[PDB]
C-alpha cells in the first residue's frame, strides 16, 4: 500500500501523455482536410471550365455546317 | 495516507474518460474522410467520361463533316 501510490502516480503520468500525444494527431488532421478542401475547390472549376466553353465550340462550329449547308439543296436536287 | 491514496484513484478515472472523450471525436471525424472524399473521387471520374466523348463525337463532327462539305461546296471550281 505504501508504494501503491507510486504505481498510481505513473498512470496519472502516462495517461497525461496519451492526452498530450493524441491531441497532436488531432492538430494535423484538421489541415489535412482544410488544405485539401481548398484543392477540391479549384479542381472542379478548372475542370468544369474546360467544359463550359467546349459546348460553345461544339455548336458554333456546326453553325458553319448548318447555315452554309442550306445551299447544297438548291443544286443537288 | 488515505486521502492521498484515494485522491489518485479518483484522479485517474477522469483522464481515462478523456481517453475515450478524445478518441470519440477522432473516430467520428476520421470517418468524414472514408466516405466524403472517396465518393468525391468518383464524381471526378463520372464527370471525366464526358470529356472523352465530346471529343469522340466532335471527332466525326469536325473532320468528316468538313472533309466533304467544303469539298462539296467547291462549285467555285
Amino acid at each position: 500500500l505504501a508504494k501503491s501510490a507510486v504505481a498510481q502516480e505513473k498512470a496519472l503520468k502516462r495517461a497525461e501523455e496519451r492526452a498530450q500525444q493524441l491531441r497532436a494527431r488531432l492538430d494535423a488532421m484538421q489541415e489535412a482536410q482544410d488544405q485539401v478542401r481548398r484543392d477540391h475547390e479549384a479542381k472542379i472549376a478548372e475542370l468544369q471550365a474546360t467544359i463550359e466553353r467546349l459546348t460553345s465550340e461544339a455548336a458554333l462550329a456546326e453553325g458553319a455546317l448548318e447555315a452554309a449547308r442550306r445551299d447544297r439543296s438548291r443544286l443537288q436536287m | 495516507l488515505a486521502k492521498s491514496a484515494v485522491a489518485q484513484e479518483k484522479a485517474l478515472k477522469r483522464a481515462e474518460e478523456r481517453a475515450q472523450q478524445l478518441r470519440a471525436r477522432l473516430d467520428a471525424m476520421q470517418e468524414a474522410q472514408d466516405q466524403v472524399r472517396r465518393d468525391h473521387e468518383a464524381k471526378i471520374a463520372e464527370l471525366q467520361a464526358t470529356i472523352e466523348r465530346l471529343t469522340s463525337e466532335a471527332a466525326l463532327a469536325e473532320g468528316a463533316l468538313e472533309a466533304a462539305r467544303r469539298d462539296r461546296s467547291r462549285l467555285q471550281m
Partner: nanobody, 99 residues
C-alpha cells in the same frame, strides 16, 4: 520518311486539361488532326489513323504526335493547341509537305 509533331511546354507541367492539334490546307480554314485528354484516352479523326500517332509524356509536358508512313496527302500546315483557365492559347506550328 518518319516524322514527329512534338508540342513542347513553357509552364504548367501537366496542368493539362483538354489539349489538341490543328491542321489546315491552303485556301481553306482550320481543322483538327488528333486530340488527347489528360486521362490517357486518345481518339483520332479518320484520316490520321494507322499513320499518325498521338501519345502523352507528362514527365516533360511534351505531347508526342508521331508522323509515320507519310502519304502524299499528308501535305499541310500544322499547329498545336491547349486550353487553360478557359482562355485558349496557340502557337506557330510548321509546314509538312510529303508527296
Amino acid at each position: 520518311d518518319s516524322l514527329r509533331l512534338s508540342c513542347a511546354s513553357s509552364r504548367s507541367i501537366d496542368g493539362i486539361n483538354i489539349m489538341r492539334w490543328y491542321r489546315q490546307a491552303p485556301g481553306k480554314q482550320r481543322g483538327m488532326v488528333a486530340v488527347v485528354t489528360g486521362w490517357g484516352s486518345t481518339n483520332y479523326v479518320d484520316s490520321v489513323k494507322g499513320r499518325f500517332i498521338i501519345s502523352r509524356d507528362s514527365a516533360k509536358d511534351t505531347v508526342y504526335l508521331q508522323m509515320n508512313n507519310l502519304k502524299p496527302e499528308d501535305t499541310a500546315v500544322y499547329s498545336c493547341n491547349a486550353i487553360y483557365r478557359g482562355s485558349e492559347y496557340w502557337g506557330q506550328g510548321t509546314q509538312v509537305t510529303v508527296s
